[PDB]
Amino acid sequence: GSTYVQALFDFDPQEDGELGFRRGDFIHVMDNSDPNWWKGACHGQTGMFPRNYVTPVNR
């Protein structure tokens, strides 16, 4: 498996440094230490994104 997910819903940056992506963006879960905000990547950028805006891939 590869620490990643998939933005079930396009996401937007609400703060300053939050990951920014759009539905289908594989968020590279870089730090799932959070229950609702995994510090991860998506397509070249990284930061905090809501683990819910994405879904875990690989199985």
């Binding site: 819903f9 396009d10 703060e15 939050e18 959070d34 609702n36 905000w37 905090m48 809501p50 819910n52």
Partner: peptide, 10 residues
């Protein structure tokens, strides 16, 4: 930290 409260999905 500033994880922010999970936003509402569309």
């Amino acid at each position: 930290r500033h994880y922010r409260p999970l936003p509402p999905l569309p």
